[PDB]
Write a structure and sequence with these properties.
Subcellular location (chains A, B): Virion; Host nucleus; Host cytoplasm
Structural class of chain A: mainly alpha
PDB class: zn-binding protein
Oligomer: homodimer
Helix content of chain A: 55-70%
Order of helices and strands of chain A: HHHHH
Protein name (chains A, B): Integrase
Organism (chains A, B): Human immunodeficiency virus type 1 group M subtype B (isolate NY5)
Radius of gyration of chain A: 14 Å
Keywords: ZN-binding protein, aids, polyprotein, hydrolase, aspartyl protease, endonuclease
Bound molecules: zinc ion
């Protein structure tokens, strides 16, 4: 569980975009791969949340 | 993994807000509990994403 995530966790590269590849590389069910996406803010949120303010 | 999520998965009640309680109830590491939060859109996104449009 946590140990698999530590080795799987790395820089936000192309592997982060395709979480399915990581699950196959470690042969783990999408459950562990999805958690990494949830922890990585870049992989979780796509566009910006609020528009901020109008200048 | 997936089987634990099916039993853990339910309606968005108070348990969904406190994911730590669910992990203790099933004695599973925050990894499985976090995945449920990532899958449940209500638990994942807090406020609204884009402001939509200005009327
Ligand atoms: Zn990432
Ligand atoms: Zn929920």
């Amino acid at each position: 569980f946590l140990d698999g995530i530590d080795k799987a966790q790395e820089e936000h590269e192309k592997y982060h975009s395709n979480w399915r590849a990581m699950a196959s590389d470690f042969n783990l069910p999408p459950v562990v791969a999805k958690e990494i996406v949830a922890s990585c803010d870049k992989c979780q949120l796509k566009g910006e949340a609020m528009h901020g303010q109008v200048d």
